[PDB]
Structure 1
Amino acid sequence: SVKEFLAKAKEDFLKKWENPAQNTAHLDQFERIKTLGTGSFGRVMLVKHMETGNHYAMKILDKQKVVKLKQIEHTLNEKRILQAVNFPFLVKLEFSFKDNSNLYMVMEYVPGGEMFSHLRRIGRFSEPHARFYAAQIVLTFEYLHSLDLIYRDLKPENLLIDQQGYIQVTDFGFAKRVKGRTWTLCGTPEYLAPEIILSKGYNKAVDWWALGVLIYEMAAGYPPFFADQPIQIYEKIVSGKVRFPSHFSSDLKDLLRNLLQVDLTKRFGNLKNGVNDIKNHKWFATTDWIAIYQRKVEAPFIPKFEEEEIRVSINEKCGKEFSEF
């Protein structure tokens, strides 16, 4: 039935992936409540859809700035992916549209902060706390991999902790729909699998390696392969040799040896049973997968967390570059 859940999820996905929804709202439909922050391409605003009452986080991206920063492909890709997927631990794109000046990504409003800064403050997560988060990433990758997506940007900064203490994976700029193998070097050095570094071509198992890195970092407070220079980071990754903190349970060490496995024919998540090798591992014995998916487990930690015009030019900017948006 997991099989049948995933098959239906793939049908929903392919439909939207092949014929992406465009201009599913317009700016005059939203009441502007508060600017939450200013990102690279423009502001993020709390808004309310005036026709329903639902509140959202609307990201505004100035098209000319996206072009200037050479982020057209990443922005288009992220949007195309986000409008086509649906899973409890993936940021939800509710509406998108564009006008003469801007692109708009109307996201579910999910206050809370990223995992990097939370981890820095807390120091390290206990093993139950780390397992709770890891379980959500496991289910999300099970979902994304079933759709032939490789996420390939897993790092703590890409994991929001929401108002319920659950994980939301954000930033699908690098994600690629890949049937088979691919070659592009992207992502943050610490989290890269050996086969990426050595330009061997790679598959979805790079996400399972990155999960290994994430779990270690969550539980240790620092990633397994670190150095001041990226070449020394690469050297460590390629060696395979991982040293564990002394407080790591025996079960955690074993899981991590199986995820941080250089040999692809032994790496958990890359074998005949796929994700189930990970889900059945002793470290996850106490994990109630269904309760996690249904958001019924109480989270170990609940985070605490002058208005200016949106000027729309009378001239369309960068129309052809963003045709697909």
Structure 2
Amino acid sequence: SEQESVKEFLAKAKEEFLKKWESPSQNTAQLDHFDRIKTLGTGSFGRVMLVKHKETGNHYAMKILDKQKVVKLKQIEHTLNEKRILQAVNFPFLVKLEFSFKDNSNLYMVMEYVPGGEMFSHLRRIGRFSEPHARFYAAQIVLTFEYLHSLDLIYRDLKPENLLIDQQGYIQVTDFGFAKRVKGRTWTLCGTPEYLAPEIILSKGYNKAVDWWALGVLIYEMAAGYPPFFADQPIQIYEKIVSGKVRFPSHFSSDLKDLLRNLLQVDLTKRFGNLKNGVNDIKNHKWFATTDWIAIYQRKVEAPFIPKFKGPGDTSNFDDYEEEEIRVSINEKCGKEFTEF
């Protein structure tokens, strides 16, 4: 009965997603609708800026990509994936794409502004999270991956830098640059070094089990204060990941260690999330026995903390970044490549 309710939820959510996936929105705002305020954060492919919508006064977070740089870095298809997927999804813990558009030089994705900062900042400052607090965050990711995987979506960039804390203390996942809709296996070498599954490093084909491996890394880092595989250079990280060895802090509970060894299985055919019972092996594990999954989904569980808020447009929960102009050429660049954006 409870299980049937979940099946029905996912079936309807797939119907809703597929309508938008097959007929994406396009060209829903323009640049002069907004004033640009300051940079909130950066990634390998661009920057995200705080902007203010002139007519409404609402603040938003605008991701800006330079088309020529996307082409040079061979990220065309990945960027088309990001926008097509984001405009089609709807889940409590996924950031909302409000508008998208392009001009002669750049591509723009305007999201809801999530003011509480990256989980990363809070985690580094406090050192580590208690197990109850790590569990609160982890449950949101479990539900998010159940949703995404049911739509044939792999996420491929889980890390604290991409988990934003909202004004109710809940997570919003950002940056779908590596997200992809795939049935069966794929091969791209992508992600962040500390979070790569062995099968990615070893140039094997891989599937949604890489997201469950990354969940193991995330839970370990939240509860320990440091990742399970760390070094000064990526190559030394990769050697540790593939080794099959992992060491746990002495303070980790018995149930936490058991869950983490099941998520950090080097053989994907033995990894939790990828066995016959799928996500239910995780949701039914002893470490999650106190979790009320529907209450998490509905945002009714008390949060570990509420971020400080000093008014609309405040960015105190984010680092400062060097600012750079947004140039728009008089000539259209890369039109054919980005036709569908």
Q: TM-score surpassing 0.5?
A: yes
Q: Distance in 2 between matches of 1:28 and 1:228?
A: 44
Instruction: Give SS of 1:265's match.
Output: helix
Map Cα deviations across residues 110-155 of structure 1 (whole Å, 9 max, x no partner): 1122222322111000001100110111011001100111111112
Further displaced range: 219-228 or 52-61: 52-61
Deviation at 1:267, TM superposition (A): 1.5
Report sequence identity in percent. Answer: 98
Further displaced range: 136-145 or 73-82: 73-82
Further displaced range: 72-81 or 142-151: 72-81
The runs of at least 4 consecutive aligned structure 1 residues that moved more than 6 Å come to: 37-43, 305-310
Instruction: Give SS of 2:35's match.
Output: strand
- Pick from 199, 203, 223 the counterpart of residue 199 of structure 1: 203
Confirm or deny that 1:180 pairs with 2:201.
no
RMSD: 2.6
Map Cα deviations across residues 278-322 of structure 1 (whole Å, 9 max, x no partner): 111111111111111111222102234799996654432332222
**What is residue 44 of structure 2 aligned with on the other side?**
40
Further displaced range: 135-144 or 93-102: 93-102
| Residues 46 and 12 (structure 1), Cα distance of their counterparts in 2 relative to 1, 3 Å cut | same
| Residues 280 and 68 (structure 1), Cα distance of their counterparts in 2 relative to 1, 3 Å cut | same
Instruction: Give SS of 1:219's match.
Output: helix
| Residues 43 and 240 (structure 1), Cα distance of their counterparts in 2 relative to 1, 3 Å cut | closer
Q: Distance in 1 between matches of 2:66 and 2:10?
A: 36
| Residues 37 and 141 (structure 1), Cα distance of their counterparts in 2 relative to 1, 3 Å cut | closer
Q: Distance in 2 between matches of 1:171 and 1:146?
A: 19
| Residues 58 and 237 (structure 1), Cα distance of their counterparts in 2 relative to 1, 3 Å cut | closer
Deviation at 1:49, TM superposition (A): 4.8
Instruction: Give SS of 2:199's match.
Output: helix
Further displaced range: 98-107 or 36-45: 36-45
| Residues 253 and 57 (structure 1), Cα distance of their counterparts in 2 relative to 1, 3 Å cut | same
| Residues 211 and 37 (structure 1), Cα distance of their counterparts in 2 relative to 1, 3 Å cut | closer
Structure 2: runs of 5+ lacking an equivalent: 310-321
**What is residue 116 of structure 1 aligned with on the other side?**
120
Q: Distance in 1 between matches of 2:71 and 2:51?
A: 26
Q: Distance in 2 between matches of 1:24 and 1:212?
A: 38
| Residues 137 and 230 (structure 1), Cα distance of their counterparts in 2 relative to 1, 3 Å cut | same
Further displaced range: 197-206 or 22-31: 22-31
Deviation at 1:54, TM superposition (A): 4.7
Deviation at 1:62, TM superposition (A): 3.6
Q: Distance in 1 between matches of 2:43 and 2:21?
A: 27
| Residues 36 and 254 (structure 1), Cα distance of their counterparts in 2 relative to 1, 3 Å cut | closer
Map Cα deviations across residues 209-254 of structure 1 (whole Å, 9 max, x no partner): 1101110111001111223343432232222221110100111111
Map Cα deviations across residues 17-63 of structure 1 (whole Å, 9 max, x no partner): 22221112233444666665677777644445566665422333343
Q: Distance in 1 between matches of 2:211 and 2:71?
A: 29
Map Cα deviations across residues 59-99 of structure 1 (whole Å, 9 max, x no partner): 33343444455443332221111111111111211111122
Further displaced range: 35-44 or 7-16: 35-44
| Residues 158 and 45 (structure 1), Cα distance of their counterparts in 2 relative to 1, 3 Å cut | closer
Instruction: Give SS of 1:270's match.
Output: coil
TM-score, normalization by structure 1: 0.89
Structure 1: runs of 5+ lacking an equivalent: none
| Residues 307 and 160 (structure 1), Cα distance of their counterparts in 2 relative to 1, 3 Å cut | closer
Q: Distance in 1 between matches of 2:65 and 2:187?
A: 29
Q: Distance in 1 between matches of 2:106 and 2:42?
A: 14
Deviation at 1:4, TM superposition (A): 1.1
| Residues 94 and 224 (structure 1), Cα distance of their counterparts in 2 relative to 1, 3 Å cut | same
Q: Distance in 1 between matches of 2:260 and 2:326?
A: 48
Q: Distance in 2 between matches of 1:64 and 1:178?
A: 27
Q: Distance in 2 between matches of 1:92 and 1:110?
A: 10
**Number of corresponding residues:** 325
Deviation at 1:269, TM superposition (A): 0.6
Further displaced range: 33-42 or 214-223: 33-42
- Pick from 100, 105, 113 the counterpart of residue 101 of structure 1: 105
Instruction: Give SS of 1:105's match.
Output: strand
Q: Distance in 2 between matches of 1:234 and 1:39?
A: 21
Q: Distance in 1 between matches of 2:168 and 2:213?
A: 27
TM-score, normalization by structure 2: 0.86
| Residues 101 and 109 (structure 1), Cα distance of their counterparts in 2 relative to 1, 3 Å cut | same
- Pick from 228, 246, 251 the counterpart of residue 247 of structure 1: 251
